[PDB]
Every structure is written in structure tokens, then in C-alpha cells.
Structure 1
């Protein structure tokens, strides 16, 4: 796998993804230690398989209390870290896949305040330049599921409105005269 070859590493990751559902925690950990090295790989097809492997690991190692053997914990931590790093992937399609994986209702709540609370867990010292943009996107994507979202922001058009004349020469007028 360490050898630089796109097709070879791709079929290696395929073999790993196919043999993963029948591996032991220690074996899975010592086999995932080199798998996470594809986060900085130029090929956009090997990173996809690595992210598939990591999403499978995340979905099949959610249990934090049960199945506690000090190996599943580290595997889950590493998988979560690399999945978080995958939020700034160069490929827009792969980044969209990763953000749709994270934006699911199982991993991020649908309530606004609950999602704001949970977004702090998606932080890592790796994604710091883009953390604010990702958080704002995750917060604003919940607006589409709102009744007022497709409605117009203002009822009447300018064709039937009143032109507001600021006739009151209040303290604002002194500043407007001082300005120009």
C-alpha cells in the first residue's frame, strides 16, 4: 500500500474495505494506521475509498461504553479525526459527500440549538481556517426545511408603497448638515 501506484493502492483499499467486516480490533487498528495516510493523496479515487472505509468504521463503532477494549476507542478516534479532516477536501464532490455524511440526522441533530451545541464536537486543530465556514454552512442549511423559506421577504412591491420622507429635523439633521 505504501508504494505509489493509483490502481494498486485502489485495489488494496478495495481489499481492505471488503475484508474489514471480519477483522479484529487490534488487526483493524494496525491495518488502519497506514490507511489514514491517503488523506494527502493526489488521486481523488483512493481518498473516496478511504472515506468509505472510515464511514463504515464510524457507523459500526459508535458504542462508546459497550465494546470498550481500548482498541475500538482509538480506532473510532482516528476515524473521526480523519473524517473531520475530510471536510476540507480539495475535490468538491468528495467534500460534498463528506459533508452530507456529517449533515445526517443520526450524527448531527435537526434542532437549531442542538446542532449549534454539537458543532463544537466537529472541531479539530487540523480544520481551523475553514471551521467557521463549515459551521455557518451547517447552521444555514437547516433554513431550507422551514415554511417561511420559500415565501417572499416582503409583502407589497415598491409600486404600491409610500416614499418615506424624513421631514423631522431632529438631532439627525444637525449631523447631516455637519457632514455635508
Structure 2
């Protein structure tokens, strides 16, 4: 696997994707440890495959029992870690895959005040530079579902309104004739 042949690595990670719904936690864990080095691979295909299996892990390990062991929690933490880190992967479609994974209504709450509290769940200091961009992008994705979003911001055109010139000798004249 770690010998770089991206055609061979693609079919290898595809085998990994196929067999992992029947692995048990310890072997899934010790196999997932050499998975997570494919962030630095230059192929979009192998990073796509790695994000597929990490999304599968994140949906298969969201607290599966009442209490889970050390290995199940560690698997889920490593998966959510690299799947946070996949928000900044240098690809304009793969980043869209990851952001549509995260913005889905069972991952971040669609409600705004719940979402703002839940955005700090996806921090992970291995990324922090793009974090504010991710935060405002997640916060402002939630406004296209609005009754005021198709409406114009102002009602009339300018040709039907007035022209307020403010011909007062108030304290506006203070700041206007001290200045220019």
C-alpha cells in the first residue's frame, strides 16, 4: 500500500472499502492507521476513496453501543479528525464533497443558534487557518432557505423615492463646517 502506485493504491483502498463492513474494531483500527497517510497523496482518486471510507466510519461509529471501548472511540476520533482535515484538501470538488458531508442535517443542526454552538465541534487545531472561513460559510449556507432571500433588499426603485438633503443647522453643521 505505501509503495506509491496510485492505480494499485486505488484498487487497494477499494478493497479496504469493500471489506471494512465486516471487520471488527481492533483490526479496523490497526488497518485504519496506515489509511490516514493518504491526505498527502497527490491523487484526487485515492483521497476521494479515503474520504468515502472515513464518511462510512463516521456514520458507523457515532456511538454504536451504549458504552463503547477504547478502540471504538479511538477509531471515531481518528476518523472525525482526518475528516475535519479534509475540509481544506486542495480540490474544488472534493472540498464540496466534504462540506456537503458536514453541512447535512444529521451532522450539523440546520438551526442557526444550535449550529453556531456546534461549529466548535469541528475545530481540530491541525486546521485553524481556514477555520473562520469555514465557520462563516457554514453559517451563511443556512440563509438560502428563507422567505426573504428571494425578495429584494429595498422595495422601490430610486426614481420613485425622495432625495434627503438634510438642510438643518443642527449639530450636523458642527461636524460639517468644522471639517471641510
TM-score range, shorter chain: over 0.9
Q: Secondary structure at the match of 1:71?
A: helix
Pairwise CA distance, 1:176: 1.7
Pairwise CA distance, 1:178: 2.1
Query: For the residues of structure 2 that align with 1:89 and 1:172, how far apart are their CA atoms?
Result: 53
Deviates more, 1:83-92 or 1:170-179: 170-179
Unaligned runs of 5+ in 1: none
Equivalent residues of 1:64, 1:73 under 8 A apart: no
Query: For the residues of structure 2 that align with 1:65 and 1:167, how far apart are their CA atoms?
Result: 73
Q: Secondary structure at the match of 2:63?
A: coil
Pairwise CA distance, 1:13: 0.3
Unaligned runs of 5+ in 2: none
Q: TM-score, normalised by structure 1?
A: 0.97
Q: TM-score, normalised by structure 2?
A: 0.97
Q: CA RMSD in A?
A: 1.0
Match of 2:37 in 1: 37
Equivalent residues of 1:102, 1:108 under 8 A apart: yes
Equivalent residues of 1:112, 1:139 under 8 A apart: yes
Deviates more, 1:58-67 or 1:73-82: 58-67
Match of 1:15 in 2: 15
Pairwise CA distance, 1:66: 2.3
Q: Secondary structure at the match of 2:34?
A: helix
Query: For the residues of structure 2 that align with 1:34 and 1:155, how far apart are their CA atoms?
Result: 59
